[PDB]
Design a protein around this nucleic acid. Sequence first.
RNA 1: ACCUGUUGUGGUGGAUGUCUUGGCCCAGGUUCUGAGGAAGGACACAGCAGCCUUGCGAUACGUUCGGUGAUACGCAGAUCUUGUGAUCUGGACAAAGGAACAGCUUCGAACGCAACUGGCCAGCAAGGGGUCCCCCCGAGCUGCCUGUGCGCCAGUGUUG
RNA 2: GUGACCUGGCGCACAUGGAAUGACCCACCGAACUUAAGCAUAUCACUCAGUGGAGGAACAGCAAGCAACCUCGAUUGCUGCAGUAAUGGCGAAUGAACGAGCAGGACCCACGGCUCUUCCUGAAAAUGGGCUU
RNA 3: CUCGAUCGGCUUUCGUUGGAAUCCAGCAAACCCUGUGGGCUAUGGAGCAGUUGGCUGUGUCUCGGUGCUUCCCAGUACCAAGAAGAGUCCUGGAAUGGACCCACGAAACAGGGAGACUGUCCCGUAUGGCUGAACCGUGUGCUGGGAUCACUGGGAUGUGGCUGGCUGUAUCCCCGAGUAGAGUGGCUUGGGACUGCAGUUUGAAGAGUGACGUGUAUCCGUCACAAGGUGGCAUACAGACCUGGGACCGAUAGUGCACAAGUAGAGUGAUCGAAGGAUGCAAAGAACUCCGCGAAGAGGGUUAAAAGUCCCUGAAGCCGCAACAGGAUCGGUGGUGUGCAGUGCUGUAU
RNA 4: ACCAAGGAGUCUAAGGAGCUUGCCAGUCGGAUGGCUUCCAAAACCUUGAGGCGUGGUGAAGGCAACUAUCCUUCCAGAUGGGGCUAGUCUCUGCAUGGAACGACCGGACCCGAAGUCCAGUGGACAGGGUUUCGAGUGCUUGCAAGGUCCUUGGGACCCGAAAGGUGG
RNA 5: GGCAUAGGGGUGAAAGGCCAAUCGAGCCACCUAGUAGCUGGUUCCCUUCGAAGUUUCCCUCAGGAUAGCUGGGAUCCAAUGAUGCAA
RNA 6: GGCAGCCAAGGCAGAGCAUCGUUGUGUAGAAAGGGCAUGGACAACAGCUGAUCGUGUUGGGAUUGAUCCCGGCUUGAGGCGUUGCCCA
RNA 7: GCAGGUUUCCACACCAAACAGCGUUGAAUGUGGGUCAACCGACCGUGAGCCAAGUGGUAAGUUCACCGAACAACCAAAGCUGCCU
Lengths: 124, 219, 214, 48
Amino acid sequence: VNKVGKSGDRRKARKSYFTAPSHVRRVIMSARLSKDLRQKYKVKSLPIRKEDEVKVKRGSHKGRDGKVIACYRLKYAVHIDKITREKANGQTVQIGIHPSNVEITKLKLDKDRKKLLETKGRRK
Amino acid sequence: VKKGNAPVPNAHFHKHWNPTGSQKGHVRCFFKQGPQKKIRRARRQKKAAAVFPRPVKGPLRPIVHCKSQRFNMKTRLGRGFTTLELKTAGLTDRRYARTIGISVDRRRRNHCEESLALNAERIKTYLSKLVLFPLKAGKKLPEGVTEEDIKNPVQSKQDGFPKASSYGKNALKPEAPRKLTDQEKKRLTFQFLRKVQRDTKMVGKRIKRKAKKEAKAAK
Amino acid sequence: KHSAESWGTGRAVARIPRISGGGTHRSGQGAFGNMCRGGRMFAPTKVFRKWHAKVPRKVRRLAVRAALAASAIPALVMARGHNLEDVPEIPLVVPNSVEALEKTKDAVKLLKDIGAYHDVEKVAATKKVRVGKGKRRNRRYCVRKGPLVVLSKRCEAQRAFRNLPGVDINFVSALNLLRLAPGGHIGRLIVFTEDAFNQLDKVLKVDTIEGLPD
Amino acid sequence: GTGRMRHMKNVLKKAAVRQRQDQVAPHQKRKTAENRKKFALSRKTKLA
RNA sequence: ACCUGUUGUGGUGGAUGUCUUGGCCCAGGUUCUGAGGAAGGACACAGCAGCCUUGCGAUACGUUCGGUGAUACGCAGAUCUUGUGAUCUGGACAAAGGAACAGCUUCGAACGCAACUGGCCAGCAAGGGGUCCCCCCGAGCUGCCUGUGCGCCAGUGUUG
RNA sequence: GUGACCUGGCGCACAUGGAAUGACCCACCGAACUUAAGCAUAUCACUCAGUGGAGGAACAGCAAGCAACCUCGAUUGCUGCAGUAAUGGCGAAUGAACGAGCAGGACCCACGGCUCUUCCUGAAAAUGGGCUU
RNA sequence: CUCGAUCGGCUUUCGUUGGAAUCCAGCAAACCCUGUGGGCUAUGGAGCAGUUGGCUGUGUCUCGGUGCUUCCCAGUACCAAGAAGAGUCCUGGAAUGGACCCACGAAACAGGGAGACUGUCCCGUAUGGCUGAACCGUGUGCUGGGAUCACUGGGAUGUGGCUGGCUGUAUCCCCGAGUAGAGUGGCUUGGGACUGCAGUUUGAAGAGUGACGUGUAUCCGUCACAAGGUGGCAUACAGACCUGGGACCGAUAGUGCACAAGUAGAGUGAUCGAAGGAUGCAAAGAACUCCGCGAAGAGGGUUAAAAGUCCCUGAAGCCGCAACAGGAUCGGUGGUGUGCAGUGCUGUAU
RNA sequence: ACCAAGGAGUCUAAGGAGCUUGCCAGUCGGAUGGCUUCCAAAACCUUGAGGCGUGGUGAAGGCAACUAUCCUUCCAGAUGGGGCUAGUCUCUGCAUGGAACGACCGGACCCGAAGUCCAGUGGACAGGGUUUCGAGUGCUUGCAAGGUCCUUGGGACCCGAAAGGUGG
RNA sequence: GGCAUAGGGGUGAAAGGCCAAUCGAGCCACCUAGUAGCUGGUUCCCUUCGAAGUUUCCCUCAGGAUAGCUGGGAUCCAAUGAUGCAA
RNA sequence: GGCAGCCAAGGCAGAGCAUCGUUGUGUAGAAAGGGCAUGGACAACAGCUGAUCGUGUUGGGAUUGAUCCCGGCUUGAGGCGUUGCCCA
RNA sequence: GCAGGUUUCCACACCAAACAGCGUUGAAUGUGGGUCAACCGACCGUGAGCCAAGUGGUAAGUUCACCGAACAACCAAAGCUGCCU
């Protein structure tokens, strides 16, 4: 017997990934911090958030940058400041980008966000 | 039925032993054996941790000879000591014996002095290997207990004593070479066996013989 | 799980049991048969099949002995596919100081210095996602087998050598033939420590060398 | 299990909470005979 | 032109290959429902909703509170941001404090009697409303078996 | 003087019961297909179906027991006894138990494997009871 | 209302603690003497007589410790989780792929996700932290030292109680009835002149009874003490919930159901009961133009690609069309040996 | 009619006869017991009763395989030894098959119970003969695992009745 | 229109008629994958060996067991050619 | 089946190598005769794959045969294969 | 107007989705409407019949028995009325 919760079952893990709620998709859609942030806060990865800057680092938009404007946790997507695309008609829409591709350039730093940074920064 | 020489089947599976769609079946598969081994071990050590500073089994069992003529010589453990063994050891209160960890069995008696002496000396090596903790932690302290026997209470895995079978496996040990005795030279053991077996068969005959003898004595 | 009856003769269909009832596609369709769709298989697998196998202890111990002899013969270690390029000797013996190893970095340092990290690197490189429907049933990867570290007791070298891909750990107190001859194939690289080596024949209760024909 | 189960679903979710606690760790009563008095006099001094 | 064939191509068709929030199997734990109303069944309830939901009940895809901490999303629409604070989540669910514990139409063991009836416009009745009366609405009580207690009794049962 | 008991009733109050649950359990009830190359006792089977009742387990359980021994010492489960003893148109077939080895003999049970009644004692186990606080 | 005891998955349950305000009672609440309650529990007991031990609020004055809080001094801790999205280049729609010299982690190479094949992209894993629950940092907590408080061991000496063993006696100890059993009938069992059970008739002993696997009578022996009851453990567990796994199946398989499946549908009903998975990396879900009533169609676009909401791929069977080759004859399909056209392949000297 | 996908000697208890492997008068012992993030319900270990085998025979009461240098006998016969010789003699005698036994163990007969003896209730064996039987012995041919072909009970290679029963 | 009679049962001016297109025993679920000495099917290649429809017994005559023929595994033995010359 | 005149070959002792001889039908049935092929476990191939897997389709080659290999095209991975052995 | 149907009734849009063995129409499709009771009926009882109750039967639930103010029982079923209060 293996203990509870720490199971490497493909079917269970995939079920969890595809039926996660929004408070769990918040942490599944985490992104990596830049080296500036990483040295400054001694924290390596955070959940991505609206209103913070990212660099795409992967995909057909690699090397582009911009502020996050929408976390579409239902689609596991992230919409960025100016990564847009015209529809068949002239309507400009947003491209979803999985936040594992992007790295984080700035943070918004709310109260709970600063508290999270401090709590993860104190080395133990 | 075979077109050969194979024995008569004698199969004994005529009564829906098979878990099919229509039947529940009479099959029990012991796939739990592996996991249950570990589970039994875990609950056994939980028993130890629960009744910690005491034998993991816990009551001293007596040693009794196995029952029939086939297992006469094999000894084993009993259920509890006889009150005669307790009184001989020095215990006259069965409930106190039980509370200090000696098992009692009033159903049992000693049909012989050997069992009495054996289990008496068993209880006497107990009660000397035994360190009683005192009630309320600081009152009177018994003899032999040295005030660090209480500091170091060690839970032994097996009860000091040898194996249960090692009491018949010692009576079954021949002597050294010896000289014969003249009765062992004259005695016919087969004749003795046949005599004591013909004895139980000639009983009514050995009454009719006396009756005829005394009738002829009258005449 | 059906109330299927056979229609019998006098009807222009086969005589298989068919679904009773009507008003749906399932009605009239054949049921209760390996040949039928939705019908039971032939000889449904029972759970009281013999899954385990019984080998006498003498024969299992002989298998262990022979697997060790083949590990000692190096024209079979390379045949099974180990790189004996940097391997100084076979069998490989190692000082007992490695049983006090705490880091996988020190484990790989040792394995490099002795000449088995070539095998470890081969395993790590050739690690792949398992071919053919094994990756669906919780067997994701097909990992090859590198060196086997046989220690004398429960020690830190287990956690040391644990993460290294091909390496397996074992103890002379209980030598696993599934590790001494994986796949049934013989001649696996074993890297015994010194006390494990010294206790090998004591544990296996080998008193003599066998007089084998040549 | 084919209807609302508008009470048994709740008692089963409660049982599930209990079961996935006891799977983590066996239960330990917060207040027992050995801590009632301590907790109570602590409460008393703290509120007085 | 028709037929037969062989290629190329286009249709009809859904075989194959690969996978899978599914099943099946084994092991471990629990078994935790109900007259304080269960399991089931109805009828309701969403700005745009029919179905489904181990959603929910006139407080009706939800209420209080806790954990989390900026979404949710198929459209729109005002609320929401270093915050009584979006969303998701937790048995209406944590508080160690005997602090705290909302609500839950209707049939159903189904409980005033019935019922293919929302009938008897049931009996009693706290209250609310329209004008002492009276009128309308009306919470709540009224099921059986059994147990104990209380009240009233029955007997040409035994007695005083 | 208009009672005291006994035995029945009606109303009220406070409570149990009721119903549900594709596994396991307890009590009953209870087939036939099948097998016997037919078939009737036998077999399937003291099973399926049916009725009632649960619990987390149920049932059993510290001997009106086993044995014949150098005795044992609750019950239960496993190994094995054992396809044996025995039953059976002595056909088809059916078929235990004890010895013995184990698990258990910590725990939410226990007067730590017993006790009620019998038996002994006995002014009901002794400063009335009830409702609120 | 206090006081005590008990409980914590908790918010209680119990008590002859005591008190106040009251009501029944009045030889004294009400059940109960047709018996509530105590003693014993058959390898023993009770009475009585005597001894030897221990548990307990102890009145009282001694001594030490542990700590509930508070105050000081000093130190420590407060929780996460490593390693190249490396400088580059190439292919690619997208690098986890490939190339160049150099990089690193591993107690973590279990898994899963991400635009393709990752140890170093994300969640996680191993490990760590908790589990006095607080998982928190101008607020705390822990330890150690010191102090106050909170609480409990060791000695006085009247107790209030108890209670174990041992010796002796002259005294005595009463064990479950329509029961067990038997005749008979029927089921049951391996149980066989009947293992057990049940009806009915009969029906004990208790100065004994039951069992001792061949019915009976006569002797003897062993074991146990029925006709009342409690009673945990090892044990079973195809459902339903919480988990961990698998040499299992992979959409005609695996549950009837991978999906709005016990659904659609059928039957008056009891019941029966299906078919049904996949766009793409991202909806970027096809703008605009011509024609048409319009759907379509022809362009023109998205996209790596139409992969076009019928959407991964798209087999066979069957069909349309074009090209080419033939076309009366079981004089057939197929085989055989050549030939003639069309069409490949292999080798190829100087 | 056509094509596609499915589609029928399977698993289990006991057993038979070969074959393979290990051990040997033993063998096996995974009921259970000791150990050690997942792997691991694995592997390892001899605490192991016991299973099978070492003895058979009789209905049973029961009884129980002779042989003191070694060795049952005979016929055929595998090897090998010592002489000898291209003639060719002796000794060894396995396995297997057949026969025998003046052998023996147990059972059944007949004539007897003579004779010896004592753990002495008169009991224990003992002798000689037979057209005698045994799944008997004569230098123990065993155990365990795997594998192949099979047998019987099971759905039993797959499909297939008219029927019988229980409840609605 | 209401109500009553239910399956070995109902009902019938009797046809064994009728009881939901069902009746010399309705239908529905289960035992049940009932049993079938009978019918049908039983999935790759090559190489080699290769039959019987006859005996006896059987409630036996469409089937079995039993010999025979047919395959395989063997054991003890037997049997089993071949130097161009020159060196 | 190395203790061989030498090279070449063979070199897995139920294999292989050399020479010679015999014999080739077959229903039921069999083979401890030999192989092709499918799903998956344990191992090996430092196997292949976005410089395009698998499927499928069409040609070619190999094979006594079961069947195997390759080119073209489709297609694009939510990959595949070869050898030993084991479970079906 | 019954039973049955259950929105098919009405209007508009709409027939290039499909159905109507056509299709500027329809019981189709989509949207939105419509059914007013002291006097018409259920409801009130009663009939054939049934249930509970009472009691009984069964190993036991029951689609177990009895329905008996013509007609039962093993049965304490008059809970209402007048005056006084």
